């Protein structure tokens, strides 16, 4: 369990960013690591086999906006990024989840297209293949995996921001709606802790949110927990040693540098550190410290 860091890749502040930085909860330190080859915001991060993957996003620059179909892998042992096979389609504001060593890329946008499509990456073959599409088009979708089922939560379908959510059952290659959230949320942070799917923050179409709700997969209910200290949309999120960490985002005024940590035992959020600069739209995941 020891020696794992929270990695934050990419993001947005004025333009899309190439930063890869890693935070050590055990000593409070931050490390700046190898930049992404292409700056991206609206990407997702995940880890398989100790390698960190950056999936999708968009490169916003003064010279334009390019939605990304890229999959790039970072090896902490070498501090190097390598390109992997690209997805079938660019996906900005994507959601990803990992089941049994396979990466699922969910939704996202390509220009004015809002995807319902979903595709699955096999690291051992370096190949993507499409799977069944969601029942709803969703960008800014939160994705998490619990008990080898994949959940897609909230987002924006091109017309309305969503409180709906759905679950993918891999052995039937089928999506089914689940109970909708109590709040409309696009760009929320979605993760799994214990037997629940948490949805933190986001934008309800009117304001950035500090509220947080969790879906108990057994009872099929959404319940609010303690709100974050800060309203945040387009936040990064991950879980580490039994606590949720939320990183950055936009509060309606500032791009936040604050990182908050949720303790489910006390139902409290605490501010634990600050990123090196404020940003939104980052990809976040946990793996071993680099060499
Ligand atoms: O609901 C919508 O229509 C789209 C929705 C959104 C959310 C909150 C908003 C909002 C728009 O408008 C002001 O608050 C969204 C959802 C997830 C994202 C993930 C990543 C991402 O990456 C780039 C990025 O961070 N851009 C930011 C620039 C300035 C502030 C907004 C975002 C942008 C995302 C945007
Ligand atoms: Cl964007
Ligand atoms: Cl992961």
């Amino acid at each position: 369990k020891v020696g794992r860091l929270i990695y934050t890749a990419g993001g947005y502040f004025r333009q899309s960013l190439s930063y890869l930085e890693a935070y050590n909860p055990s000593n409070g330190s931050w490390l700046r690591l190898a930049d992404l080859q292409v700056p991206r915001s609206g990407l997702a991060g995940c880890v398989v086999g100790g390698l960190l993957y950056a999936v999708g996003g968009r490169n916003n620059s003064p010279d334009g906006n390019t939605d990304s179909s890229a999959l790039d892998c970072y090896n902490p042992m070498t501090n190097q990024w390598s390109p992997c096979a690209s997805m079938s389609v660019p996906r900005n504001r994507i959601g990803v989840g990992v089941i049994d060593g396979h990466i699922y890329a969910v939704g996202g946008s390509h220009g004015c297209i809002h995807h319902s499509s979903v595709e699955r990456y096999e690291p051992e073959r370096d190949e993507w293949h499409l799977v069944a599409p969601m029942l709803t088009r969703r960008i800014g979708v939160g994705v998490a995996v619990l008990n080898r089922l994949l959940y897609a939560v909230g987002g924006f379908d091109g017309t309305n921001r969503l409180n709906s959510a759905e679950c993918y059952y891999p052995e039937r290659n089928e999506w089914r709606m689940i109970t909708p959230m109590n709040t409309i949320r696009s760009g929320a942070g979605v993760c799994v802790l214990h037997n629940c799917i948490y949805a933190a923050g986001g934008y309800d179409g009117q304001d950035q949110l500090n509220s947080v709700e969790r879906y108990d997969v057994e009872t099929e209910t959404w319940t609010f927990v303690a709100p974050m200290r800060h309203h945040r949309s387009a936040l990064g999120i991950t879980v580490h040693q039994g606590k949720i960490y939320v990183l950055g985002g936009y509060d309606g005024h500032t791009f936040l540098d604050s990182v908050e940590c949720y303790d489910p035992d006390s139902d409290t959020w605490s501010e634990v550190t600050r990123m090196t600069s404020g940003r939104s739209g980052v990809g976040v995941a946990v793996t071993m410290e680099p060499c």
Side-chain angles (χ1 to χ4, degrees):
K1 288 223 235 263
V2 306
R4 286 189 216 170
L5 309 183
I6 297 174
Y7 286 77
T8 179
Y12 183 83
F13 181 63
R14 291 321 191 241
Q15 60 177 332
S16 300
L17 309 170
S18 61
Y19 314 149
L20 178 65
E21 298 178 314
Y23 172 61
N24 191 333
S26 301
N27 65 14
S29 70
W30 282 94
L31 293 161
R32 184 161 182 200
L33 297 171
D35 275 10
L36 287 161
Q37 291 180 204
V38 180
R40 290 130 89 181
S41 49
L43 75 163
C46 66
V47 167
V48 182
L51 300 158
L52 171 67
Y53 291 86
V55 197
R58 162 175 276 206
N59 180 182
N60 294 311
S61 73
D63 281 349
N65 309 328
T66 304
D67 295 310
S68 178
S69 65
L71 178 67
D72 299 283
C73 59
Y74 173 81
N75 185 350
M77 292 178 73
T78 66
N79 190 38
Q80 285 180 21
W81 289 95
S82 297
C84 297
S86 294
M87 294 187 296
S88 72
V89 69
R91 303 180 181 275
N92 183 32
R93 306 168 166 178
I94 193 181
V96 306
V98 175
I99 307 180
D100 189 36
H102 309 114
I103 304 174
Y104 288 79
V106 177
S109 55
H110 174 204
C112 67
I113 299 315
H114 297 91
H115 300 312
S116 62
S117 66
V118 179
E119 51 194 298
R120 180 192 91 131
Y121 180 71
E122 298 162 7
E124 48 291 340
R125 312 193 208 51
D126 188 34
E127 265 167 20
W128 288 94
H129 299 281
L130 285 155
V131 300
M134 303 182 281
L135 308 174
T136 311
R137 294 171 177 167
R138 306 177 183 271
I139 84 172
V141 58
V143 172
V145 173
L146 180 51
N147 189 35
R148 295 192 168 187
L149 299 175
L150 174 76
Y151 294 84
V153 177
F156 183 62
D157 67 9
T159 298
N160 289 305
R161 277 137 200 121
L162 303 172
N163 68 333
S164 68
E166 51 190 292
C167 182
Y168 177 73
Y169 297 91
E171 56 267 49
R172 294 192 182 157
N173 190 37
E174 171 176 341
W175 290 89
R176 294 182 183 174
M177 299 296 302
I178 62 163
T179 310
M181 291 179 294
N182 296 305
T183 313
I184 293 167
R185 307 178 186 269
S186 181
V190 170
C191 54
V192 170
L193 178 57
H194 307 332
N195 218 38
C196 304
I197 305 301
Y198 285 70
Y203 188 64
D204 69 359
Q206 141 177 42
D207 196 11
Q208 296 76 28
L209 302 166
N210 69 350
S211 66
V212 183
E213 55 189 305
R214 72 184 179 200
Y215 176 76
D216 186 295
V217 301
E218 311 298 350
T219 61
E220 303 182 42
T221 63
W222 289 92
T223 301
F224 288 97
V225 303
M228 291 186 291
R229 168 173 170 76
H230 296 270
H231 294 246
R232 333 176 165 244
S233 65
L235 56 147
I237 193 165
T238 195
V239 173
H240 173 66
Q241 305 212 332
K243 291 175 188 189
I244 300 172
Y245 291 76
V246 297
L247 296 79
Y250 181 68
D251 76 351
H253 182 57
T254 310
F255 293 78
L256 299 172
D257 56 14
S258 53
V259 180
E260 292 184 62
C261 183
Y262 179 72
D263 179 1
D265 303 316
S266 62
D267 187 31
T268 61
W269 290 89
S270 310
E271 299 253 334
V272 295
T273 190
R274 288 187 201 275
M275 293 184 293
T276 60
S277 60
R279 66 195 77 153
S280 59
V282 302
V284 182
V286 176
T287 192
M288 293 300 150
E289 46 191 356
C291 295

